[PDB]
Coordinates of C-alpha atoms and ligand atoms in Angstrom, one line a residue:
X3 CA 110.0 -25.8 20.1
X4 CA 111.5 -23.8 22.5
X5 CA 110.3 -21.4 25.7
X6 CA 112.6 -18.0 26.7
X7 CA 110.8 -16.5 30.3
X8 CA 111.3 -12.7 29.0
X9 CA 113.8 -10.5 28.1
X10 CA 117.7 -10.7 29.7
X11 CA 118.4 -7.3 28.5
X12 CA 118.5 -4.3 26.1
X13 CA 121.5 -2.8 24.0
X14 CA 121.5 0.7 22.9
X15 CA 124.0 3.0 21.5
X16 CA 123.6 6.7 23.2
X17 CA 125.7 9.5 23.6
X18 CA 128.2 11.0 26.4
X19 CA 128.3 8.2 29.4
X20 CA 127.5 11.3 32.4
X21 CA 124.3 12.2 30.4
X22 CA 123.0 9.1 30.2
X23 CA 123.5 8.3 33.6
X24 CA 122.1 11.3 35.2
X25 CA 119.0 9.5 33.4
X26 CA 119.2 6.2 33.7
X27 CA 120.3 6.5 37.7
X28 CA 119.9 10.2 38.4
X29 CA 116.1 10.5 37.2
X30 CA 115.3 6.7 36.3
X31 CA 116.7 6.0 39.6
X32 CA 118.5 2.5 37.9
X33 CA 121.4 0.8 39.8
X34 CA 125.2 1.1 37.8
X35 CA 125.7 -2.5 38.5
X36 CA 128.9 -3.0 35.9
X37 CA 130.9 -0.6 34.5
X38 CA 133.0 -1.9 31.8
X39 CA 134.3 -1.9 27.9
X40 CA 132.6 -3.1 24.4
X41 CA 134.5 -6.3 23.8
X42 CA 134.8 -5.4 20.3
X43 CA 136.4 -1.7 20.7
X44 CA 137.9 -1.4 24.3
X45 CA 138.1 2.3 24.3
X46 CA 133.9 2.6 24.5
X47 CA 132.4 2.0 27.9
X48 CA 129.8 -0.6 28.2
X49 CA 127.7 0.4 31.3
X50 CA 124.7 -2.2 32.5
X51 CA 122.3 -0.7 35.0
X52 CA 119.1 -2.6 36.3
X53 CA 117.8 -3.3 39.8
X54 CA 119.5 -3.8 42.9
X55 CA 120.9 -7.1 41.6
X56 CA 121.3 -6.4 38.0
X57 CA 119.0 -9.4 37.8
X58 CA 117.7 -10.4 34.3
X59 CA 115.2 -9.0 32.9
X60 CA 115.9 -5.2 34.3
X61 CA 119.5 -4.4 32.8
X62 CA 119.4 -2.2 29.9
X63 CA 122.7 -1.7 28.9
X64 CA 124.6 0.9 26.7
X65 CA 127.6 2.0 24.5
X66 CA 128.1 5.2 25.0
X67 CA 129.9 7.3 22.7
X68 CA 129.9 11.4 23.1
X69 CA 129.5 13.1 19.9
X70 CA 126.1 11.3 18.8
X71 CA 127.0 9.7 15.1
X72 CA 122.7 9.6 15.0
X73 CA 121.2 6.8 14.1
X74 CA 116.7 6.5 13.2
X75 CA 113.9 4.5 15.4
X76 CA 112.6 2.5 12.4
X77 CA 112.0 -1.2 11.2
X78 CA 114.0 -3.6 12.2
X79 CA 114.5 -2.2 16.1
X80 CA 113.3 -2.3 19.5
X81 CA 110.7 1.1 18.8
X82 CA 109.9 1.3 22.5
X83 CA 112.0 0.1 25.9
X84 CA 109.2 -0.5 28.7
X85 CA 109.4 -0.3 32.3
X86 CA 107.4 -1.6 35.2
X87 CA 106.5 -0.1 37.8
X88 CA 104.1 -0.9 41.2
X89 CA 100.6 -0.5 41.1
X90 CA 100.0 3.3 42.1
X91 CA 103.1 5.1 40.9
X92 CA 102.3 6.5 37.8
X93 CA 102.3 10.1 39.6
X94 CA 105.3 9.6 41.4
X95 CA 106.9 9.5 38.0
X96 CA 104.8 12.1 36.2
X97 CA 105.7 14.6 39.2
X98 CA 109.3 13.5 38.4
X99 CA 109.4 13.8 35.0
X100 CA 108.3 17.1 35.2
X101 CA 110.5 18.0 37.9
X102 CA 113.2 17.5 35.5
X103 CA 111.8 18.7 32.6
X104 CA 111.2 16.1 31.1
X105 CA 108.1 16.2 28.6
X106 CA 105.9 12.7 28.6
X107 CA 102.3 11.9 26.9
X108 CA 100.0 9.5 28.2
X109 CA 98.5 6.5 25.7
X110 CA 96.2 3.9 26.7
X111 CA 96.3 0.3 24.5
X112 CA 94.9 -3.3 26.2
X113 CA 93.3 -1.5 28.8
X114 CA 96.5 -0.5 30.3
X115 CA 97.8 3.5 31.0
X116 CA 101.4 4.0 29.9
X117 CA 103.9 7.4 30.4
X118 CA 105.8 7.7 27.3
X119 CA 108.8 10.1 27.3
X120 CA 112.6 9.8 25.9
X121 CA 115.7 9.5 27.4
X122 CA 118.5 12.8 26.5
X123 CA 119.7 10.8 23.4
X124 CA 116.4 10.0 21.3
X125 CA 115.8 6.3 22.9
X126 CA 111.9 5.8 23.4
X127 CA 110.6 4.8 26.7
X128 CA 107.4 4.1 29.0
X129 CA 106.1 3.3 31.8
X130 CA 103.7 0.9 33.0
X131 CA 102.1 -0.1 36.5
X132 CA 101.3 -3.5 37.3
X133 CA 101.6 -6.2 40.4
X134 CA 103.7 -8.5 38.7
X135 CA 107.5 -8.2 39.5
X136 CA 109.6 -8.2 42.1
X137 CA 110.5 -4.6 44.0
X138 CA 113.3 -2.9 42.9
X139 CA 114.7 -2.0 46.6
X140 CA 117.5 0.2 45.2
X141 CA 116.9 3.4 47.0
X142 CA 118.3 6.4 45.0
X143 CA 117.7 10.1 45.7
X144 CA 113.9 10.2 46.5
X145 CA 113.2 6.8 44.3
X146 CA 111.9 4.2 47.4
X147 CA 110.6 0.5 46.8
X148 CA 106.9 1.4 46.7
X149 CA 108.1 3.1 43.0
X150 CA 110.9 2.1 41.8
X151 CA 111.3 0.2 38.5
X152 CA 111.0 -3.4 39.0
X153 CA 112.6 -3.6 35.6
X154 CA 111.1 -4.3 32.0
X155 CA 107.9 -4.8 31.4
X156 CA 108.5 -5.2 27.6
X157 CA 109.1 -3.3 24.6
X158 CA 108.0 -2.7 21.4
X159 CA 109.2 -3.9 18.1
X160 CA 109.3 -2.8 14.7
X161 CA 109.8 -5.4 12.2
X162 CA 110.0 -5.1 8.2
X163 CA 108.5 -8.5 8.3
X164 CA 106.1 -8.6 11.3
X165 CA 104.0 -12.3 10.3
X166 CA 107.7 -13.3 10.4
X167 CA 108.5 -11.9 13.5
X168 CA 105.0 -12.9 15.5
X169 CA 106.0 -17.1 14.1
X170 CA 109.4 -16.5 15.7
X171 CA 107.7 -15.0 19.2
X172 CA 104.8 -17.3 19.3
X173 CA 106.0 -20.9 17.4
X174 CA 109.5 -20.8 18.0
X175 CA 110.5 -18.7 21.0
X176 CA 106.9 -19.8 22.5
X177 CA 105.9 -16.5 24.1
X178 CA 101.8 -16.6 24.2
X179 CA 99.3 -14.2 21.9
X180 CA 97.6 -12.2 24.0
X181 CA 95.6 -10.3 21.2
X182 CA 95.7 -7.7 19.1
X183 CA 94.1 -4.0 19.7
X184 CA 95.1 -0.7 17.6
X185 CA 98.4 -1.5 15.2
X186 CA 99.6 -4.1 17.7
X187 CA 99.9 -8.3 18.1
X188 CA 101.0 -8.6 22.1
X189 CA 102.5 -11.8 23.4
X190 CA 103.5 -12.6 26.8
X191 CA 106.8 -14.9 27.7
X192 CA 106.3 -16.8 31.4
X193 CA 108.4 -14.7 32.9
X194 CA 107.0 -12.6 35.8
X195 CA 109.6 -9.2 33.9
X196 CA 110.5 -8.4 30.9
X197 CA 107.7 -10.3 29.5
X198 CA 104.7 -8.3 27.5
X199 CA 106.0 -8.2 24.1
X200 CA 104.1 -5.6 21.7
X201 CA 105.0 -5.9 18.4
X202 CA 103.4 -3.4 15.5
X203 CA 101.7 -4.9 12.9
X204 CA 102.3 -2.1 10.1
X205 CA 106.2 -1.1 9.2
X206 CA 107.2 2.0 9.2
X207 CA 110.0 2.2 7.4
X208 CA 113.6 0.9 8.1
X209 CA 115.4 2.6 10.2
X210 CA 119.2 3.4 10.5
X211 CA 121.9 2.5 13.1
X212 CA 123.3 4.3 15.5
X213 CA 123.3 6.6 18.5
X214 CA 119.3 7.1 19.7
X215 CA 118.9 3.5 18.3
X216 CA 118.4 0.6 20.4
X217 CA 120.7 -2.4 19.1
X218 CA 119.6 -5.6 20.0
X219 CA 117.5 -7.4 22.4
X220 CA 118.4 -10.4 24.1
X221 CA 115.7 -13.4 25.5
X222 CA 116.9 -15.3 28.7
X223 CA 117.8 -19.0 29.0
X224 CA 118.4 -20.6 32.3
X225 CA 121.7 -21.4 32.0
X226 CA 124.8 -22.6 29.4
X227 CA 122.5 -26.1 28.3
X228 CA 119.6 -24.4 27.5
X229 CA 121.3 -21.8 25.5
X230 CA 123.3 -24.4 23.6
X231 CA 119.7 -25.7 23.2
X232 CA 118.6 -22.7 21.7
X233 CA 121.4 -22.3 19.6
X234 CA 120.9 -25.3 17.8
X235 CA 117.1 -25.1 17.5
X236 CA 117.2 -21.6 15.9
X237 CA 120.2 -22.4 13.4
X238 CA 118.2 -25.7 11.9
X239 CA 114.8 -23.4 11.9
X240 CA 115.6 -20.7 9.7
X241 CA 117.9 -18.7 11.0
X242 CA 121.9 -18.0 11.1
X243 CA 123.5 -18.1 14.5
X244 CA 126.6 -17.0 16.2
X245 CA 129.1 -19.2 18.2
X246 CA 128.9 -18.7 22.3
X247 CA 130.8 -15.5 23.0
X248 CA 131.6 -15.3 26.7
X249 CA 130.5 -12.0 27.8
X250 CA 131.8 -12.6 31.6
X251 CA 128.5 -11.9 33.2
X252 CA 126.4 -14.4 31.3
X253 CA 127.4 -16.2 27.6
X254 CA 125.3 -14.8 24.1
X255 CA 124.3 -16.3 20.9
X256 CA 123.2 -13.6 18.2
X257 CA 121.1 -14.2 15.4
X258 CA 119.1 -11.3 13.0
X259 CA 115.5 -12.8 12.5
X260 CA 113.9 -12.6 9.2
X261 CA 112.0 -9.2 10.2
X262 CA 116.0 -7.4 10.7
X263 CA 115.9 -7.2 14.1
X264 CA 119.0 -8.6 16.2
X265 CA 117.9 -10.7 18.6
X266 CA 120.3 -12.4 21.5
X267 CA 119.7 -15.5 24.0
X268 CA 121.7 -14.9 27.2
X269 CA 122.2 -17.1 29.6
X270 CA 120.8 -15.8 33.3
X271 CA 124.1 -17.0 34.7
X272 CA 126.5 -16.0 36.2
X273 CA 125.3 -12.2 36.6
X274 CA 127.1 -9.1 37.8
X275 CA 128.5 -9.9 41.2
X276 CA 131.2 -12.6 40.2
X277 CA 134.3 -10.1 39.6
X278 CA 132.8 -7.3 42.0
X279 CA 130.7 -8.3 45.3
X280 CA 127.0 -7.4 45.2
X281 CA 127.1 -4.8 47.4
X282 CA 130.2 -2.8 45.1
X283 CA 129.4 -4.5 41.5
X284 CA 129.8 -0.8 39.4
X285 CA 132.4 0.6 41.3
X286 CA 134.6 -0.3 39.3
X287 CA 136.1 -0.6 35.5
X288 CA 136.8 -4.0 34.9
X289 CA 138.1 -5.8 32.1
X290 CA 138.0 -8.5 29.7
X291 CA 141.0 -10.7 31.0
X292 CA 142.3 -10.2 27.0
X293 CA 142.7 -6.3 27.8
X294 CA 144.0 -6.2 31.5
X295 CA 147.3 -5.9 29.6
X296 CA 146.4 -2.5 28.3
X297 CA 144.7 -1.5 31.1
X298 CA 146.6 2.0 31.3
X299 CA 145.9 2.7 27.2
X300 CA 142.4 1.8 28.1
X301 CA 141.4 3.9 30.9
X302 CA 144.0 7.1 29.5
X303 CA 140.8 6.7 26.8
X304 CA 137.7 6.7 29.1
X305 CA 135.9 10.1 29.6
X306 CA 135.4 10.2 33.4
X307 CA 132.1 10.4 34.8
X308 CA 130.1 10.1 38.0
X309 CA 126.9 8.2 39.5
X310 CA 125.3 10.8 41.2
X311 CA 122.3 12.0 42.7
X312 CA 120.6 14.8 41.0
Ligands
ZN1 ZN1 123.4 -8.3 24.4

């Protein structure tokens, strides 16, 4: 079959675009590299943040609409978002947390420490410490290399149908099992980010869409071949699959697997830096070429907001 290296990125639906970027780069210390609309409804933002070079495999992105229409963590979602971080700066972000009030727990499972906390609209996250992974050298208020987040280092998913869901991640996608410990089957992708994969081995319940709810996930390919690869392997194994939608900063294929989770393959081309240079991708709103047209309609729409250091 086929073999994704880790997660491309993560889609949630949140609230007001200021709140969640005081957390996402005021606390979490993440880089706005695009700052753009959904290409289904052009008056909702669709923000991307990740590392210094959006690179796959640390962008979670977001549509954020103020007025939280609130969706429920259940079955068939993402449960848990997880972020890596170097080996040693688990305090600098428990001091941080607390700093901004922030309440977290601490949970231990495969002999690893994790900080679990939400962000201001419901979304679960953690973080983890490990070697693997490149630095993250966006500097941002008091957030330096030696602690940044390097990006993903998984998530967590809740499937109605999880033996459905660990055939897709081990047989078809060819992510490795690592074991199981607790409620959980882990499985790692080659990837060296966005690559331990947890999934829970007893549903919960279904949950319900909306704000607070993490969307879909999407699994990296190497580029437009491989994707078209992928899109022809999943849709003769099982599964209904979307045409290639050009998203601008890399082309998706959707397809819901059998335990209701959305699940995306992305290609890692082109990436963020291809309408904006590197050193100014997220300065500005840009556009589907479609909308540029209405660009006046569009941004009379927008709720203004800042990236700023808290
Ligand atoms: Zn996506």
């Amino acid at each position: 079959a086929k073999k994704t290296m880790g997660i491309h990125h993560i889609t949630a639906i949140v609230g007001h675009p200021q709140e969640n970027t005081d957390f996402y780069a005021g606390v979490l210390g993440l880089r706005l590299v695009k700052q753009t609309v959904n290409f289904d409804d052009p008056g909702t933002y669709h923000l991307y943040f990740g590392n210094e070079g959006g690179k796959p495999g640390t962008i979670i992105t977001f549509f954020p609409w103020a007025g939280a229409r609130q969706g429920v963590i259940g079955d068939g979602q993402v449960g848990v978002t997880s972020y890596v971080v170097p080996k040693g700066a688990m305090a600098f972000w428990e001091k941080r947390l607390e700093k901004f009030n922030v309440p977290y727990t601490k949970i231990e499972r495969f002999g690893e420490q994790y900080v679990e906390f939400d962000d201001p609209h419901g979304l679960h996250l953690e973080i983890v410490e490990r070697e693997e992974g490149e630095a993250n050298t966006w500097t941002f208020g008091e957030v330096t290399p030696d602690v940044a987040i390097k990006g993903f280092g998984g998530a967590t998913l809740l499937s109605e149908q999880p033996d459905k869901t660990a055939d897709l991640l081990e047989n078809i996608m060819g992510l490795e099992r690592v074991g199981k410990e607790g409620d959980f089957v882990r499985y790692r992708s080659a990837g060296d980010i966005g690559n331990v994969i947890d999934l829970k081995l007893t549903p919960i319940g279904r949950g319900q869409m909306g704000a607070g709810t993490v969307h879909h996930i999407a699994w990296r390919a190497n580029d437009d071949e491989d994707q078209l690869d992928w899109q022809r392997y999943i849709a003769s194994h099982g599964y209904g699959v979307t045409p290639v939608r050009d998203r601008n900063y890399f082309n998706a294929i959707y397809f819901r697997e059998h335990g209701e989770i959305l699940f995306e393959i992305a290609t890692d081309p082109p990436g963020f830096a291809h309408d904006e240079t590197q050193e100014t991708m997220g300065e500005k709103l840009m556009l589907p070429v479609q909308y540029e047209p209405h660009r006046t309609q569009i941004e009379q729409g927008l709720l203004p907001f800042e990236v700023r250091e808290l």
